Design a protein around this ligand. Structure first.
Ligand SMILES: Nc1ccn([C@@H]2O[C@H](COP(=O)(O)O)[C@@H](O)[C@H]2O)c(=O)n1
Ligand SMILES: Nc1ccn([C@@H]2O[C@H](COP(=O)(O)O)[C@@H](O)[C@H]2O)c(=O)n1
Lengths: 204, 214
């Protein structure tokens, strides 16, 4: 439950070469990488084992699983079989959909992160209003890992009060007052010098 | 579209999926595929369905990310050959619009998922269903995918989206479903049948007897 330097690289690139280049350059500073469907749909799910075998990265699949229970189970099993250490799941489809993911994780010895809220434009339409109930639902389903919205620390304070001191929270300095790790993408992966960018961030 | 019947190819092994789809091709030309098959076999399987059978493919990916990422998922998906992609409306208007913009650029289609009917859907989705469908109408969404249960829910959805929108829904069927949906989605009853082709052929006959206007 410990992320190296409390810094997670959000690898949102879709090209294998740039993805691997950047990951290899920041491995002396970061050991946890979050990847999404753009990369895996473009390069194949086998890229996950590549990240792990090549660099020893812990991999969080940010797939925002949001289907019915039976399908969620299949997606999680396929993702864990490919090597993901954790998978991010939506809470809006309800408790049984989340439970299906948690069960595959228990069975396979992996982890599920519950997405409690989103902060992009439009998230205020339906997600914002359900966020507190979704976080509380997570606590009651035994969820121990949460992903918070890209927002000001004040709001993470509220989420932290709901999930408790023992849960693990990750979110896109002040943020680290409430989150266990911060997620950084572009400022690192588009940098001409990814290593220097990561090293600078860790300076805090 | 062909025969108002869409095949839900939910099997995870490449062999059976390709086999079954090929056997029913005479009656069905539109197939819906989800993440399990794609993540296990690769996105290349989409081009395979299209190149080999001339199938129209609907990627049931229920896209639910932020606008920028939704754009990339859609682009990756249409590039692989999908004719349309299913997108969640709960994340909001901007996330749905990002998908519509990529579909517009590439000449493809977006299907908005407005509600679900599985256990737990009542916690947050059910209460937002009508508002999400109306959001779709406001965004100019023209294709919708309905829930799997309760035809009383289809009549409501049809009422909100209007007669000019296209609606596909899982399954007194097929008659019951086609009273509101333009096409029915059928999976197990076809792909688990001993003679898939026979199952599809049968279903198509029933639909023929309905004499559905427009
Ligand atoms: N509006 C936004 C933008 C980005 N993010 C998250 O932050 C991560 C990294 O973002 P950056 O590339 O902008 O640093 C993304 O992968 C995404 O999960 C978010 O949660 N909301
Ligand atoms: N419980 C279920 C079962 C199936 N379905 C939908 O109906 C499609 C085909 O279902 P059948 O196999 O039951 O005909 C599935 O691919 C899925 O999208 C659902 O929404 N809820």
């Amino acid at each position: 439950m410990d992320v190296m330097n409390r810094l997670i690289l959000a690898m949102d690139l879709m090209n294998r070469d740039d993805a691997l280049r950047v990951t290899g350059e920041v491995r002396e500073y970061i050991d946890t990488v979050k990847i999404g469907y753009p990369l895996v749909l473009s390069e194949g799910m086998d890229i996950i084992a590549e990240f792990r075998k090549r660099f020893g990265c812990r991999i969080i699949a940010d797939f925002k699983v949001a289907d019915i229970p039976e399908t969620n189970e299949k997606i999680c099993r396929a993702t864990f079989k490919a090597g993901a250490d954790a998978i991010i799941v939506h809470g809006f489809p309800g408790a049984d959909s989340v439970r299906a993911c948690l069960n595959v994780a228990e069975e396979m010895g992996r982890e599920v992160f519950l997405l409690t809220e989103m902060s992009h434009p439009g998230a205020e339409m339906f997600i914002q209003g359900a966020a507190d109930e979704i976080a509380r639902m997570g606590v009651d389903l035994g969820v121990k890992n949460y992903v918070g919205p890209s927002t000001r620390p004040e709001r993470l304070s509220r989420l932290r009060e709901i999930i408790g001191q023992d849960s693990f929270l990750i979110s896109p300095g002040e943020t680290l007052r409430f989150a266990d790790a911060i997620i950084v993408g572009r400022s690192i992966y588009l940098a001409d010098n990814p290593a220097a960018a990561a090293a600078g961030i860790i300076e805090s």
